[PDB]
Design a protein around this motif. Sequence first.
Motif, PDB file in Angstrom:
ATOM      1  N   UNK A 532       0.885  -1.136   0.051  1.00 26.08           N
ATOM      2  CA  UNK A 532       0.002   0.169   0.104  1.00 26.08           C
ATOM      3  C   UNK A 532       0.793   1.381  -0.128  1.00 26.08           C
ATOM      4  N   UNK A 545      -7.517   7.251   4.310  1.00 27.89           N
ATOM      5  CA  UNK A 545      -8.595   6.326   4.299  1.00 27.89           C
ATOM      6  C   UNK A 545      -8.996   5.646   5.430  1.00 27.89           C
ATOM      7  N   UNK A 549      -9.792   7.022  10.034  1.00 28.13           N
ATOM      8  CA  UNK A 549     -11.029   6.409  10.640  1.00 28.13           C
ATOM      9  C   UNK A 549     -10.619   5.270  11.449  1.00 28.13           C
TER      10      UNK A 549
ATOM     11  N   UNK B 103     -17.444   2.159   6.074  1.00 26.73           N
ATOM     12  CA  UNK B 103     -16.329   1.535   5.508  1.00 26.73           C
ATOM     13  C   UNK B 103     -16.025   0.321   6.047  1.00 26.73           C
ATOM     14  N   UNK B 104     -15.872   0.389   7.458  1.00 26.92           N
ATOM     15  CA  UNK B 104     -15.379  -0.721   8.288  1.00 26.92           C
ATOM     16  C   UNK B 104     -16.161  -1.939   8.045  1.00 26.92           C
ATOM     17  N   UNK B 108     -13.847  -3.991   0.795  1.00 26.95           N
ATOM     18  CA  UNK B 108     -12.692  -3.041   0.443  1.00 26.95           C
ATOM     19  C   UNK B 108     -13.175  -2.804  -0.845  1.00 26.95           C
ATOM     20  N   UNK B 109     -12.823  -1.337  -1.244  1.00 24.22           N
ATOM     21  CA  UNK B 109     -13.150  -0.684  -2.378  1.00 24.22           C
ATOM     22  C   UNK B 109     -11.836  -0.697  -3.406  1.00 24.22           C
ATOM     23  N   UNK B 110     -11.030  -1.282  -3.064  1.00 28.20           N
ATOM     24  CA  UNK B 110      -9.614  -1.470  -3.765  1.00 28.20           C
ATOM     25  C   UNK B 110      -9.778  -2.150  -5.359  1.00 28.20           C
ATOM     26  N   UNK B 115     -13.825   3.017  -6.889  1.00 27.39           N
ATOM     27  CA  UNK B 115     -13.042   2.988  -5.676  1.00 27.39           C
ATOM     28  C   UNK B 115     -13.022   4.369  -5.087  1.00 27.39           C
TER      29      UNK B 115
END
Lengths: 694, 146, 49, 48
Positions: A532, A545, A549, B103-104, B108-110, B115
């Motif tokens: 990443x 992101x 959070x 989001x948690x 995952x949006x990857x 995205x």
Amino acid sequence: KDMVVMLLSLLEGNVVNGMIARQMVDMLVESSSNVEMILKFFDMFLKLKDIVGSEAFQDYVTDPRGLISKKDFQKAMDSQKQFTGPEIQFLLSCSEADENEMINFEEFANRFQEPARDIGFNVAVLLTNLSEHVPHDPRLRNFLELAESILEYFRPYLGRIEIMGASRRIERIYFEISETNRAQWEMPQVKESKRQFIFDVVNEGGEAEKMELFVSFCEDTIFEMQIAAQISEPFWGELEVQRVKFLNYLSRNFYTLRFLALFLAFAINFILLFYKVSDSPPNMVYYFLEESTGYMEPALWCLSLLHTLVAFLCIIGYNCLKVPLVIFKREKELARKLEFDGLYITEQPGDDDVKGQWDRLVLNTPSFPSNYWDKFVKRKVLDKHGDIFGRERIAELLGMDLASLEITAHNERKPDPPPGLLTWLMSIDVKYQIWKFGVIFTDNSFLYLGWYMVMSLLGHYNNFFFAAHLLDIAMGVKTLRTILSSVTHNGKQLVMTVGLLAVVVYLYTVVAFNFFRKFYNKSEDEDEPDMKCDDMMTCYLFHMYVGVRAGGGIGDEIEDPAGDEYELYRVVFDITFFFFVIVILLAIIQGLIIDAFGELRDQQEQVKEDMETKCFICGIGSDYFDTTPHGFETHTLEEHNLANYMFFLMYLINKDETEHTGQESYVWKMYQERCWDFFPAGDCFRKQYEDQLS
Amino acid sequence: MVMSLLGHYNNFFFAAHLLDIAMGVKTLRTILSSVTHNGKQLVMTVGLLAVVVYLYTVVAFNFFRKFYNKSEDEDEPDMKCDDMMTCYLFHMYVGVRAGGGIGDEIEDPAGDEYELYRVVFDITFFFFVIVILLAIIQGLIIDAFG
Amino acid sequence: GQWDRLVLNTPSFPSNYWDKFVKRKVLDKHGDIFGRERIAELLGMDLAS
Amino acid sequence: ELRDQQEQVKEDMETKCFICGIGSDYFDTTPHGFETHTLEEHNLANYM
Ligand SMILES: CCCCCCCC/C=C/CCCCCCCC(=O)O[C@@H](COC(=O)CCCCCCCCCCCCCCCCC)COP(=O)([O-])OCC[N+](C)(C)C
Ligand SMILES: CCCCCCCC/C=C/CCCCCCCC(=O)O[C@@H](COC(=O)CCCCCCCCCCCCCCCCC)COP(=O)([O-])OCC[N+](C)(C)C
Ligand SMILES: CCCCCCCC/C=C/CCCCCCCC(=O)O[C@@H](COC(=O)CCCCCCCCCCCCCCCCC)COP(=O)([O-])OCC[N+](C)(C)C
Ligand SMILES: CCCCCCCC/C=C/CCCCCCCC(=O)O[C@@H](COC(=O)CCCCCCCCCCCCCCCCC)COP(=O)([O-])OCC[N+](C)(C)C
Ligand SMILES: Nc1ncnc2c1ncn2[C@@H]1O[C@H](COP(=O)(O)OP(=O)(O)OP(=O)(O)O)[C@@H](O)[C@H]1O
Ligand SMILES: Nc1ncnc2c1ncn2[C@@H]1O[C@H](COP(=O)(O)OP(=O)(O)OP(=O)(O)O)[C@@H](O)[C@H]1O
Ligand SMILES: Cn1c(=O)c2c(ncn2C)n(C)c1=O
Ligand SMILES: [Ca+2]
Ligand SMILES: [Zn+2]
Ligand SMILES: [Zn+2]
């Protein structure tokens, strides 16, 4: 009445215990019997007016025609225990009993109410004026007691204000408040406007502009009263009368339509909760309602069309109710800058004021003061700046025909106004309409209503757009608007601290890309790693992101730093990112919101405290007035009541100039000259005559 | 008294009586007054929270449904956003209570076309709901103490 | 206000209030303008008593 | 704490004269007395 008006003129500029005032009291005492008889005339018929409407009197009335015999009238009046023997006999003589001794008490009570109202009010004013200027005369209280009913009846209409007269002294002015003016002033919309105005001047206003803002509020309030009166309710002609009735109905019910649109939005969105996506028709999917009743699908179509109609009516309701005030205010301020500042004659705004640059289109329009009351602003500007700037150039700027000035003053022309639509086409001032529409399109309230309508139409393309309308609760409910104001109060600070958050996270990303990249493998797989932090853009997105959070900061997401050369460095990176970003920077965002609640709360307290501790007009504190029991309460309701100044301005406008008194002419002249020196500032009638009154 | 009688039917009803400490002790009543002082505002901001979450649900149902598979199983998927009512409940139940927002919980949006759109959805829901709206609820209580 | 109409004509309206002659005072104040017999009916008063 | 400091400074300037220290209440006996006092009588710019 004319004799009393002459007597009131002798009291102009009269000080407390003045010789003229004391002479007038002696004159009344010298003719006490006649004065008592005159006062006994007014109260007898004022009492008779309320007696005939009483329930006890109606018990005696037995004739179906609505009449009453003299004997029945005799036993009715003495049962009230308000009149004496001779008084009842006099009332019987005044009653126009027929040959059957039947009395039409309905017309009898109303016979003298109108003819004697003007004289009765002036007598009440005369006694009130004498009482407040000769307060230590025992002979005058007898007249006041005998005129208690007259004074009580005219109390809501006897308006009194204090002004700084030309004699450099505080003078008290008594005038008449009409029933319509007081009724319009007590309307809830006018009262709400007053509360908003009071909050603005007290919170974000100055002392030098306080009176000018107050007068501007009075002018706006008078204009709004006219709009309310116009919209109130008791083949071209047939459609026009229905068109104005339809427009007035929308204007009167503008807020109900706004509530109705909000209600329909919730009803539509409640149905949308039953939407269901399925591959099978009711590789593309289909969205359909899932319900067993079978009526929701037709209901959604009906509500969607109805909501669109209501939103469209709100725009029409808005532009017929609120837009005229917007145009009135803009024309008002533009006219004064033309005359008292020469905005387009001398200064010529430097192209950075879009409001000033847009108003150039209306200067030469034939109908520039369409909503503003002063229709002779161009005439006044020409006389003021014509000599120094050029009469022909001023006329060109304002679109004035100099040759037409004289002919209008010579005589008047009566042309033919043909009621044809074709003639109405070229009678439209196109340039004025373009200017007016630009003002409307720049109005925040109109643009919101326009967005609501556009979204309603988009709702027909996809019904889910009807979700946007549920936002309206932001301004539909005032409680939410106050809560949301606690977020927008420090909105600029909230944006900056988020921008600061992005910068601090970038600095963490730079350190990570340079030194801690190995720990950013987010793949449980062993042969294909999902690094990443092999790119700055990817690593920066990762920190923004998942890092922000995360509860424990970036450390929670990245691989453990144990048994590594950079373990201590990574613990500092993880703990500092937790403190600076998760702990400190999020506390700032929450701290700004909490501080806004306190800041907004004290503004309400400060405005409330100022109103209850100082007079809005003179500014003298309540402590001085409280020397006299309930002094501040009486001062703010009788002496310097701001509502009476509103009424006095309306009184001067309606009253003929030739009938204005010396005090009225003095105030009226200064209103036209925009001089607010007549408002008492730091002084009052009580303070000026402290020795005499006490 | 009614609760005491119901206590005879099931003794557990005698639990309700422990609430009396609200007015039995004046210290707690002052503390609880700091909650009821802005109670109307607290109700409205919760209602505002429900509306903002509905708007997020509409966007999810329309554009981000694939990411709402909450089943580790591969042949029977537990899609949480195939219905508006189910998806709205999902956002209100697990989305609000999650520390990092929706989001948690969602996938995952990857490596996906949407995205960036999903990162805006996740970050905005974290800011508006978890950060701002919960600060308002806490801010109202703190302001009431002052 | 609507619930208090039941107690106006009750013989024991001022049971706890110290003024036991409120009905007498109201009759003398509003009897002439509203009707003594109608006030007595409203307050449950016996004029002959 | 920072917010009230701004409010306190603003309140003091609009309630007392920077030079003589007399409150605005005394000068307001005369209409616009404090405004004229701070712009004509005890204007701090004139002392500069
Ligand atoms: C974009 C929202 C603007 C306001 C945002 C605040 C509201 C917050 C969220 C609201 C939820 C919005 C619903 C999203 C779901 C819609 C899905 C959809 O229909 O997606 C649409 C996308 O189309 C569009 O985008 C059309 C909209 C035009 C541009 C959209 C931007 C709105 C313009 C805003 C106007 C003024 C805004 C300026 C002020 C700023 C805001 C104050 C596709 O359909 P569909 O083909 O398959 O079917 C139609 C069925 N047949 C095709 C068979 C007939
Ligand atoms: C060596 C100790 C210095 C650390 C002091 C930290 C104090 C603050 C400094 C922050 C930046 C650290 C950069 C150090 C400069 C180079 C150090 C060096 O000699 O570098 C050392 C390595 O030592 C380290 O690992 C230092 C690790 C630093 C970690 C410190 C964590 C604190 C994070 C703070 C984030 C800042 C955000 C602050 C926001 C404020 C909000 C209030 C050897 O290199 P190198 O041969 O392998 O080739 C460099 C690698 N490249 C080939 C990519 C160039
Ligand atoms: C419902 C509580 C009302 C107040 C709520 C505030 C208290 C917060 C929580 C309290 C805990 C409550 C205990 C729950 C466990 C009880 C389990 C149970 O017994 O469940 C009961 C359910 O029965 C009932 O529901 C009966 C209660 C009647 C209706 C209940 C509502 C209460 C009415 C409230 C009165 C006024 C309220 C208005 C004010 C609003 C509140 C201020 C079943 O039994 P059980 O058959 O197998 O055995 C009995 C043994 N033999 C059968 C063999 C004899
Ligand atoms: C395209 C970029 C627009 C995104 C701007 C976002 C600004 C705010 C808008 C919010 C609603 C977004 C709806 C966009 C309208 C349609 C866009 C379009 O053309 O649609 C694009 C898709 O682009 C997108 O994916 C847009 C994704 C939007 C995600 C934005 C995340 C922000 C979430 C904000 C939530 C609002 C809550 C705010 C609460 C306030 C509290 C303070 C193509 O369609 P389509 O052929 O596949 O058929 C539509 C699908 N259906 C068949 C179901 C109809
Ligand atoms: N010159 C003034 N004229 C009127 N009120 C004044 C003036 N100076 C101070 N006040 C204060 O303004 C307060 C607001 O007036 P008040 O509440 O009586 O108005 P209202 O017409 O009855 O309705 P509302 O409660 O909506 O304001 C008064 O309590 C009074 O103490
Ligand atoms: N001696 C003083 N001299 C000047 N101002 C004073 C004095 N005492 C009190 N003040 C107050 O200080 C305030 C600040 O002055 P003012 O705002 O008019 O200054 P400016 O030069 O127009 O610019 P700015 O708004 O940047 O201060 C004035 O409103 C005035 O009430
Ligand atoms: C409506 N109105 C005013 O509001 C006004 C005025 N003169 C001064 N003012 C304030 N005139 C003549 C007027 O008609
Ligand atoms: Ca005259
Ligand atoms: Zn005053
Ligand atoms: Zn000074």
